[PDB]
Design a protein around this nucleic acid. Structure first.
Ligand SMILES: [Mg+2]
Ligand SMILES: [Mg+2]
Ligand SMILES: [Mg+2]
Ligand SMILES: [Mg+2]
Ligand SMILES: [Mg+2]
Ligand SMILES: [Mg+2]
Ligand SMILES: [Mg+2]
Ligand SMILES: [Mg+2]
Ligand SMILES: [Mg+2]
Lengths: 222, 124, 256
RNA sequence: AAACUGCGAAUGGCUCAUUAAAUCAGUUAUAGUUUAUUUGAUAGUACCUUACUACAUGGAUAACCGUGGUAAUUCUAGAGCU
RNA sequence: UCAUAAUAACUUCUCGAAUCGCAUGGCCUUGCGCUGGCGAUGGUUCAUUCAAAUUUCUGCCCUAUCAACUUUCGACGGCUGGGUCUUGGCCAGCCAUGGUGACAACGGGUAACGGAGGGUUAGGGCUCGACCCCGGAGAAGGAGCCUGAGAAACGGCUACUACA
């Protein structure tokens, strides 16, 4: 009974296997998404609350949440379904799926830390993996560092040094080129759209004025 | 051979669209087998005051009984125009371009089909 | 499944293209635009099978999208753009303009125009209705939409449209005594004078055309194209739209 | 490069099993209809919703990092971004 | 009862550009102020193009040891509606008893895909046409369906039968 514990805050991942099921007994009748204390898993897990996120049975079939069945079922999946990767536009496929009710006849179960305890498990809380920075949208940069409407977002960009190909050259940094930022090009494009829109405006009205002129002179001579 | 090689040009036209001149070349070469593509090129170049790299010829079919060959000759205004316009197979045979070495057709297709079973950066 | 075709067979290609039968299995297929496909003329055929510049598919494709061929003054990068009737083809690299006009044999010829005939086109009025806002509009044979035509252009008239603004210089009314060219049927490429117009309710009215040799003919107004009111407004190809029999054609060769 | 997005994959090629007013052929109609693409034109509107902004709105998801399952598939899950 | 215009309203209110590249130029209230082209993609309506889909008239080999066939449960028609991109017994309700046939209907056979055409003939004909082109249908045998402008698609999916 291998357990895949995840720590969303620190981004830590480790697998630990439990050979005695009596520490898993309180997990048998639970369901995906249920927050369960991990007291039997202790005593290093006292004061720890775990959330069920799914698991794989002994045949490797994943758990699709929302299927209320302790056994395996066959479903017709589609693009947006949670255990199918459609390789064609509109293609649907029938695949074997394990139900959301966890229990016996299972190989690996996925866990997540909900509430921190007063312990230090080697591999979960001891390591704080840095978040893969970073934001790319202009407003997301603005809200992240608390800028204002008149601040220069152009300079508040996360850096990351890169080592060249062992040539002993000076290292430089990459940047997340910011999208949805105001440029004179965008303003010029907005200016051009109105410029093209206005140009059509007189052209139709002068032709309408012109066509009225011929009709005016045609009726006069007629 | 002792007898001179006589050059002739018909259907001559100036084509600035590809920056070249198109014509059909006729050869009168009695008492000799034929003329090579190479020695044909300098003779055209010296006749048109161009260089060897200015001149390319397509295909020489000797007329029945010998003594005459006909073909399509191409001379360019600038060497850059030839390199940009002349097809790669023509460049490799005349010698100023390197052949694009690649695997066999079936092996490349088999190489591609194995890629379809892989996803992401695991392909490379 | 079922859908539109994308290939064309060389044997089933239009005859007037004068395509080599043994060159390959397929033939160029026009995409869309200045149609009908029967008849039209692809740009590749015009530049490769009539000018050889452009010897095969690769070179003509390079020429097309080097932006050097102006159809009616407009850049076309389509290798198989359907060049059609009265269309003006321009090659500024060599400095000349071509126009597509049928000859007596019924096939497009390489007709040349020097400097000023490339500034306009004759088009046949196919539709006159009221536009989206009660605005009268006119449709020509080359899909050109004109948003403000003269009120006296009813049907089948030929309008001289300017080739850099689209404006109409002048129009010719469809009536007897006008110079007409037969653009369809058995009498392709024949230029004459309209003499009689008999009306048959049912959509198959007949037009009688008289040639320069006092020859009487008949055609529908689906193939009658008006060229001039008193004299042709364009330059005709050699022969001036007069068809000669097999004997006189041979005699012209023996004399010349 | 990988991956997301768009397009194509309804073309072509093969065969003649079914099929006897059926297919098909010539000739008609769509005033009884749809139409990606191409081509030419073509849209000014104080209409009313968000905390508000037009010098510019919001939330997700890949690729990627790391943890796996099954003997096995162009199977996929849990977790952190963007 | 067309094109088109106008009025009274309506909508799980469509479209009316929060997209990208090059050139970067002009003006005066000098403000990081106002303006400026070429393109790329995309967008409503109309026309057009490639078309598709139905549709009118006429024309198919042998057989009576096939003479009556269709109509309960659509067969011929009328009406109202639904469904379709649209017409239509296409379908749902109500009414009437019609429709085809000795000028061969209906049924059966084809070792029958149709045609342009091949062979051979003085004329009149006989015979072949799976097959380089046009149209139709199919993807082991039926049915159903998603995406999509376009498929009842099969080098798409789902189910059953056979095979594996
Ligand atoms: Mg099919
Ligand atoms: Mg076309
Ligand atoms: Mg096909
Ligand atoms: Mg339009
Ligand atoms: Mg009825
Ligand atoms: Mg009805
Ligand atoms: Mg059969
Ligand atoms: Mg057979
Ligand atoms: Mg299906």
């Amino acid at each position: 009974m291998k357990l895949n514990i995840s720590y969303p805050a620190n981004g830590s991942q480790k697998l630990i296997e439990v050979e005695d099921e009596r520490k898993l007994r309180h997990f048998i009748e639970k369901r995906m998404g249920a927050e369960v204390p991990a007291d039997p898993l202790g005593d290093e897990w006292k004061g720890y609350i775990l959330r069920i996120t799914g698991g794989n049975d002994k045949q490797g079939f994943p758990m699709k949440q929302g299927v209320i069945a302790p056994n395996r079922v066959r479903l017709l999946l589609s693009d947006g379904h949670s255990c199918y990767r459609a390789r064609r536009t509109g293609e649907r496929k029938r695949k074997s799926v394990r139900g959301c009710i966890v229990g016996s006849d299972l190989s690996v179960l996925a866990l997540a830390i909900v509430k921190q305890g007063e312990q230090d498990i080697p591999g979960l809380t001891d390591v704080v993996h840095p978040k893969r920075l970073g934001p790319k949208r202009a407003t997301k940069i603005r809200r992240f560092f608390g800028l204002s409407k008149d601040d220069d977002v152009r300079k508040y960009v996360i850096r990351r040094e890169v080592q060249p190909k062992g040539e002993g050259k000076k290292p430089y940094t990459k940047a997340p080129k910011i999208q949805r930022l105001v440029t004179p090009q965008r303003l010029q494009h907005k200016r051009h759209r109105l410029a093209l829109k206005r140009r059509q405006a007189e052209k139709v009205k002068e032709e309408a004025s012109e066509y009225a002129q011929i009709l005016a002179k045609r009726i006069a001579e007629a | 051979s002792d007898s001179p090689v006589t050059l002739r040009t018909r259907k001559f036209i100036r084509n600035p669209l590809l920056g070249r001149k198109q014509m059909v070349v006729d050869i009168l070469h009695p008492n000799r087998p034929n003329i090579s593509k190479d020695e044909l090129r300098e003779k055209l170049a010296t006749l048109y005051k161009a260089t060897k790299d200015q001149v390319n010829v397509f295909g020489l079919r000797t007329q029945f009984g010998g003594g005459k060959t006909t073909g399509f000759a191409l001379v360019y205004d600038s060497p850059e125009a030839m390199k940009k316009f002349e097809p790669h197979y023509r460049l490799v045979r005349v010698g100023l371009a390197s052949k694009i070495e690649k695997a066999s057709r079936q092996q490349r297709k088999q190489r591609k089909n194995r890629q379809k079973t892989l996803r992401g950066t695991a392909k490379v | 499944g079922r859908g539109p075709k994308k290939h064309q067979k060389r044997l089933s290609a239009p005859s007037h293209w004068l395509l080599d039968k043994l060159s390959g299995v397929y033939a160029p297929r026009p995409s869309a635009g200045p149609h009908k496909l029967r008849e039209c003329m692809p740009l590749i055929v015009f530049v490769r099978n009539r000018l050889k510049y452009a010897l095969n598919y690769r070179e003509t494709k390079a020429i097309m999208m080097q932006r050097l061929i102006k159809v009616d003054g407009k850049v076309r990068t389509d290798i198989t753009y359907p060049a059609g009737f009265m269309d003006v083809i321009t090659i500024e690299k060599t400095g000349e303009n071509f126009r597509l006009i049928y000859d007596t044999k019924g096939r497009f010829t390489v007709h040349r125009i020097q400097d000023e005939e490339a500034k306009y086109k004759l088009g046949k009025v196919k539709r006159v209705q009221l536009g989206k806002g009660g605005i009268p509009f006119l449709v020509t044979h080359d899909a050109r939409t004109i948003r403000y035509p003269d009120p006296l252009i009813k049907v089948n008239d030929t309008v001289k449209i300017n080739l850099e603004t689209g404006k109409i210089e002048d129009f010719v009314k469809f009536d007897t005594g006008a110079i007409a060219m037969v653009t369809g049927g058995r009498n392709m490429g024949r230029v004459g004078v309209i003499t009689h117009r008999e009306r048959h309710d049912g959509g198959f009215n007949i037009i009688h055309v008289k040639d320069a040799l006092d020859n009487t003919f008949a055609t529908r107004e689906s193939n009658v194209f008006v060229i001039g009111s008193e004299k042709p407004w364009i330059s005709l190809p050699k022969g001036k739209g007069v068809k000669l029999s097999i004997a006189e054609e041979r005699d012209r060769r023996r004399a010349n």
